[PDB]
Each structure stands twice: as structure tokens, then as C-alpha cells.
């Protein structure tokens, strides 16, 4: 009965393509002509964090815009104080390969995962005063690529066996599973209200999953290569994905199609991390040609450049008040760019 | 110097953490990383059993007289996007089986285990990250290949090959076909033929890693 099933599936995908061509009354680039250009964005490095002896893989800002976590290949999970360059914590890790790290919104727990297929959650406030293992989560058969804290109780994790999972840290079991991908799911980005989340994989398509219900709502396929990073827009209506074909694309949830494609003819390098600003006018993209670019999200023109690293930029983070931008790269330096007048 | 007492104590704690990280890096620096990338039917289980005497990455710590080797085993990855983590390894232990030219794949497509191994080795040699890294090739299961080669001629596996069914001749031809693949003068393929029961593998690995470290030192100093 596979023939009528494949024909029905092609008819449904034609119906969805027809609906997306019907909804496209006008583009975004046409209606932004009246809007004034942002202009030059002069940013300089304020602080430089040098506590790692190996390449840094990921980072995450705290909600107080004060502390930051960073994971390295040598097996260290260092929690920095970004203003006065003081090491607040240094967690020695069991597995040296750690590809992601997250900081709780309350500020109590720090998770980290990698090639060991186990998500290790550490507790920072104890009566002993020494950080220790608090929870170990092992229910995946692929490498753990990203994790983010919805709250202290529940953590959303993304693995390399084409799965995402909602975990309950107290009991230690999978609450619900998200199995809609066919490639390795590289990154996720939570909504601010923690209702939905987006997930980009290696099938060149991003999915919109629901936390509570646990079923995929929307599918976005406009990339010709693997998606590496994803960043949800602050108001709760759009998101942006970066891929290896030197393009990052801004997609809309309610329009159910892509809005804008940020690309450049001289750039032929991959995108490792994307992030928005506090208002959402500047799109920060960490390219593979040793420097980051500041794009204008409404005008689609290259506004600025952050060139301070010697090796490829692996991770990039913006605070909640949007005061400074921290960039980590494989040359073992965390550089905190900020802009003044 | 216009800092409070807590800030000074925090700076001293940061200096303590700096010294601890420095000592951990000095302990870590004296270790050699090896990548055991292989196929399922390769017989790499025999290799780790010979080196020694669990979904996550397996870690093996075996020490010779003066050098400590730390071997990493991964296991079911279609496109292996995690390969960038293993840039800093000094050598890749890449094992292929000699007995696999008969048995076809489970899919039953017109592909052979040897041809898949050649494609995988070609993908490793052409990889952007592995242009500097050298390969140590082990040809496992000599006994089974020696037995099977009398019954079956080496025609189905290599049509271009036109030679007599001799164990030494064909083994040399397979070694030449594997050495043909690289097009970079920086790396050298260290070929060695192994068996189910051997004890010289640790010696072979020690000599090859010693050669690779001396060659890396000479290339870093600008001499080689």
C-alpha cells in the first residue's frame, strides 16, 4: 500500500508548498526601504579570559549577566566572572569531550554533555563547599549536542541519535521524547515563555516542538546544508538558523516559511553560532573564517565585524540586558566585545 | 590596589585555581592520544583485547617502559560529524580485515567490505582535519585470508588485478592498494599485518608512534 501513501504524501507537500506560495503576499526586504540604516558598529574587546589549555566548545550566560560557564576539550568546566576576570568555579570533568554546557536560570545547577552520552548535572551550592556530581542522565544512543534548562526540575536535551528528550532531574527518567528528525540534531533554542522550542538537525530542516504535548507542529526546510546553530527571536514569533553553506536564514513561525537569507559572496565559510541582540536588530554570526559578523536583521547588509581570534569561532553569547557579547573560539580565549561612543 | 578584602581573597583563590589548572595541564601534556576508527567487522575487539592484556567512548590506558598510551574507541555513526574533536591526535589506528573480501554487505548491493574500507580510508586521507595526522594500518586475520585465498581467487574483489593466487603477492598488492590512496607527502602509512594471537602489536605501535613524534618534532623545528 506504499504507492498511495507516497502519492498522498507528495500531494500533502504540494498543498503545503501551494499554501506557502499563497501566503507570500510580499517579501520583507521591500518594506524595509524606509527604515534608516544602522551604520558602523565599533566594538572593542573589554576583557579577555585565558584559563583554558584546550579549545573551548560552548558557553552560556547567567540571568544576572554576571557569571558565565565555559567547557573545554582538556576536561574543565570553568565558571568565570566576566567583569573582573576572576575564576569563580572550576569543575574537573569525567569525560574530556564536552560539546555543550548550560547554566540554570536560578543559578544552582550546571549541566554538560559530550561523547560519553551522559548528561552530567553539577550542583554549585552545597554545605561542603566543593562542587560535586548531582545527577547523571543516560538514555541516549548518540552524542549529546546541546542542552538547555527550562527550570531546575526539567532539562531539554538534544542527542545524536536523531532525538530530543525532556528529562526530570529529580527522578532521572525521560518525561517525553521528540522523534521527528532523520539527521543529527545539532542545536536547540528555547522560547522565553518555555512553551515551544525549535530544533535544527543535519537533515537541513528545523522542527517546532511542543514541550507539554510532545508533538511536532511546524517544519522549516530552506537550507542546502547541515544546520549548526539556531537562535529564537525574543518576542516569540521568529527564529534564525546558521548553516555550512555560508547562509543564515531568518524564519517566521506564523507565516510558516522563511523571511530573509543573510549571505555574502566573499564568505564561503560555515556558521558555528548565531545569536540575536536585546532588541533583535543585530544578528551576530560566528563564521569559520576566524571572525564574527554583525548583520543588520532588517536591511540584510553587513554592519560590522568582530576580528580578534586566531582560530575558528565555536560559541557566542549575548547577555539578557544585552550589554556585551562573549565569543569563544578554538584558540582558547573568551573575548568580551562591547561597544562605546 | 583599591579593592576590598573579599576581592583580594577572590583574586588569591583565582591564583590557586590557576596553579591547579597549570599542574593539571602539565600532567595531561605527557600523554599520547590515539584514535581507533574502524568498521564493525574489522576485528578491533581483538585489537583492544591485545592492547589491554558501555555506549559511551571507551578509554584504554596502557603504558610501555617510558611512554603512556591512551586509546579511544567510539564504536554507529553514518557521517561522523564529531571528527573535529580528534584533530589533536598524533596517530590514527585504522584497522581493516583481510578476510572480508568474500562476504558482501547485509544490504546485498554490489559493494564489498574491502571496497567500503578503501572508501573510508580515502575519506580519512582526504579529510581537511587529518592532513597532518599519520595513519597506522593493521591488516587483521592473516590466517583466514591465507586459508580462503586457496579456495577463492582474488578476482571478484579487484578486477584490475591480474596476478597469481599467492598469499605474499596478493598481500603485498592489498598493501599497495591501501598505500596508493594518500596524496599528501606529510603523512606516512605505517602498515603492519596482524593475527588473532600476537604479542608484538604493542612494540609495533610504540615504534610507529616514536617515529611519528620524532617526525613531528623535526617538522616543527623546520628540518624535515
Amino acid at each position, epitope marked *: 500500500e506504499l504507492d498511495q501513501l507516497r502519492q498522498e504524501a507528495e500531494q500533502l507537500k504540494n498543498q503545503i508548498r501551494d499554501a506557502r506560495k499563497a501566503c507570500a503576499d510580499a517579501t520583507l526586504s521591500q518594506i524595509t526601504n524606509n527604515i534608516d540604516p544602522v551604520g558602523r558598529i565599533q566594538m572593542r574587546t573589554r576583557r579577555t579570559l585565558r584559563g583554558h589549555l584546550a579549545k573551548i566548545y560552548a558557553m552560556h550566560w547567567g540571568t544576572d549577566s*554576571r*557569571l558565565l560557564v565555559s567547557a573545554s576539550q582538556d576536561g574543565k568546566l570553568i565558571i568565570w*566572572d566576566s567583569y573582573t576576570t*576572576n575564576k*569563580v568555579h572550576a569543575i574537573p570533568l569525567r569525560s574530556s569531550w564536552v560539546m555543550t554546557c548550560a547554566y540554570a536560570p536560578s*543559578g544552582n545547577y550546571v549541566a554538560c554533555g559530550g561523547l560519553d552520552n551522559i548528561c552530567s548535572i553539577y550542583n554549585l*551550592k552545597t*554545605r*561542603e*563547599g*566543593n562542587v560535586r556530581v548531582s545527577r547523571e542522565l543516560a538514555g541516549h544512543t548518540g552524542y549529546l549536542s546541546c542542552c538547555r534548562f527550562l527550570d531546575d526540575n526539567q532539562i531539554v536535551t538534544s542527542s545524536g541519535d536523531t532525538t530530543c528528550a525532556l528529562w526530570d532531574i529529580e527522578t532521572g527518567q525521560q518525561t517525553t521524547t521528540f522523534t521527528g528528525h532523520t539527521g543529527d540534531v545539532m542545536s536547540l533554542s528555547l522560547a522565553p515563555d518555555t512553551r515551544l522550542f525549535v530544533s535544527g538537525a543535519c537533515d537541513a530542516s528545523a522542527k517546532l516542538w511542543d514541550v507539554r504535548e510532545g508533538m511536532c507542529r511546524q517544519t522549516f526546510t530552506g537550507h542546502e546544508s547541515d544546520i549548526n546553530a539556531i537562535c529564537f527571536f525574543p518576542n516569540g514569533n521568529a527564529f534564525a538558523t546558521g548553516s555550512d553553506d555560508a547562509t543564515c536564514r531568518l524564519f517566521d513561525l506564523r507565516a510558516d516559511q522563511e523571511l530573509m537569507t543573510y549571505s555574502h559572496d566573499n564568505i564561503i565559510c560555515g556558521i558555528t553560532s548565531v545569536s540575536f541582540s536585546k532588541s533583535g536588530r543585530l544578528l551576530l554570526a560566528g563564521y569559520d573564517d576566524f571572525n564574527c559578523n554583525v548583520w543588520d536583521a532588517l536591511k540584510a547588509d553587513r554592519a560590522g565585524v568582530l576580528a580578534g581570534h586566531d582560530n575558528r569561532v565555536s560559541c557566542l553569547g549575548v547577555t539578557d540586558d544585552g550589554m556585551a557579547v562573549a565569543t569563544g573560539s578554538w584558540d582558547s580565549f573568551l573575548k568580551i566585545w562591547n561597544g562605546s561612543s | 590596589c*583599591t579593592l*576590598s*578584602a*573579599e*576581592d*583580594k*581573597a*577572590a583574586v*588569591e*583563590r583565582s591564583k*590557586m585555581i590557576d596553579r591547579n589548572l597549570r599542574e593539571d595541564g602539565e600532567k595531561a601534556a605527557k600523554d599520547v592520544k590515539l584514535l581507533l576508527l574502524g568498521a564493525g567487522e574489522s576485528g578491533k575487539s581483538t585489537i583492544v583485547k591485545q592492547m589491554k592484556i558501555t555506549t559511551g567512548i571507551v578509554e584504554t590506558h596502557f603504558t610501555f617502559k617510558n611512554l603512556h598510551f591512551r586509546l579511544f574507541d567510539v564504536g554507529r555513526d553514518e557521517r561522523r560529524k564529531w571528527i573535529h574533536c580528534f584533530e589533536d591526535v598524533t596517530a590514527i589506528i585504522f584497522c581493516v580485515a583481510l578476510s572480508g573480501y568474500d562476504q558482501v554487505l547485509h544490504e546485498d548491493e554490489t559493494t564489498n567490505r574491502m571496497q567500503e574500507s578503501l572508501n573510508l580510508f580515502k575519506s580519512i586521507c582526504n579529510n581537511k582535519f587529518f592532513i597532518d595526522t599519520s595513519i597506522i594500518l593493521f591488516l587483521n586475520k592473516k590466517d583466514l585470508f591465507g586459508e580462503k585465498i586457496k579456495k577463492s581467487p582474488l578476482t571478484i574483489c579487484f578486477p584490475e588485478y591480474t596476478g597469481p593466487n599467492t598469499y605474499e603477492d596478493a598481500a603485498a598488492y592489498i598493501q599497495a592498494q591501501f598505500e596508493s590512496k594518500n596524496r599528501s607527502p606529510n603523512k606516512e602509512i605505517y602498515c603492519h599485518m596482524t593475527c588473532s594471537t600476537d604479542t608484538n602489536n604493542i612494540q609495533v605501535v610504540f615504534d610507529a608512534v616514536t617515529d611519528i613524534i620524532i617526525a613531528n618534532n623535526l617538522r616543527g623545528c623546520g628540518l624535515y
Partner: single-chain antibody
Amino acid sequence: VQLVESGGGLVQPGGSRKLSCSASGFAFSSFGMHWVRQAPEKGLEWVAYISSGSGTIYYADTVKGRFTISRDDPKNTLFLQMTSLRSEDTAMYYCVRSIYYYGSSPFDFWGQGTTLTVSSADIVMTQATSSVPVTPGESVSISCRSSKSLLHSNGNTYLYWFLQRPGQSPQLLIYRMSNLASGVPDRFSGSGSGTAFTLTISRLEAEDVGVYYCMQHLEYPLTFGAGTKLEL
């Protein structure tokens, strides 16, 4: 977490005494260590501090040159060699652990105490009210005052509020005048200007009877409050 003091007794003047502090149940080597002395009818008085890793040592002015603090990290033990003991040294000696980083809670654990019985530029801390008779269910507001402004340029105000219950160890209540200590119920609160501070109790209970101390932690040597006892 356990700190056990030993080495006390009754001595003649001029004699020496090696005090020990036995630590268990925590990471001793990551914590700086404090000796604090309380006289029988007087308030708490700081003695000494040794940093984690023994790199940095601080003594009081009166105490300087006669007492030697040291620590043995593998044995998890704090030592205090005392020489030239005068009559003023007769006191209850407390061993204290303290860690200093952003967000930490220093002075969060107080020892049991050992008994010794012998036969200008410094910031002055002033609690002009020595005692207040209280009744349960009311709301209390006790004040403290410092001779120097305790607001630092980084925004922190280094003021700590302690409770010493009668016949028990001191207990931390408020650290840095804006943070509630671990295990303390949320009925306590702190509020102050640069020079005048106020600890406010809402719906005082039975266990709130004791002596309240204020403390500046702006600069060494540490100087403590005179103490405010709550009468029933």
C-alpha cells in the same frame, strides 16, 4: 560539617598552649580559617585569619607578635600556638570556616568553642542600645552604626548580622545586608543607609531570643558590634 576545638584549660600567665581545631565533613583546604574570641561578660572579638593555601595571614593589633596561626591541610586541622598569655586572654575561642567568592556566604558555620582561663584608624562599630525587652508576635527594629561609610565602589556594603543564642554557638543571619542566609527563615530583613543600619524582625518567636551582632567586613582588622541582647 563539624568543627571541634581542643587545647583549652586553666593556665598560669606567660605559658604557651597549642590549640587544635579538628574539621570534618567538608573541603577544609578550600576554606579560609578564623579564630574569634569571646570574653565571658563582653562581646565577640576577632583574633586571626589564614587564607586557603596559607599564602596570606592576618592578625589583630593587640594579638600581633604573640599568637601564631597555622594549618595542616592533609590532616584537616587548624593550629594556634599561643605564647605570653596575659589576663585578658581568658575567653571562649571559636574556630570558623569562611570562603570568599561572588555569591558566597562567609561566616556561615561556627564551632563549639574552647575555654581558656589565665590566672584610631580602626573602624569603630557602635550599637548605642544595649538591650531591648521584646514580646512574641511584635516587630522589632534594632540599629547599628559605623564610624566609616561601608559602601564600596563595587556596590556591596560589607555588613553582617549574627545571632548568638544563650548557651549555643553564634549563627549567621544576614550577609551583605541584602541576602538571606541558608536555613534562616524569611521573617528577618535588613535595611540601611551608608552609615546607619537596621535589622527588622517580623512576628518574633521563641527561638529568636539571643544577642544580635553587627559587623563591618570592609577592611582588616575586623571589628565587631557591642551586641544587643533580647530580653523576654
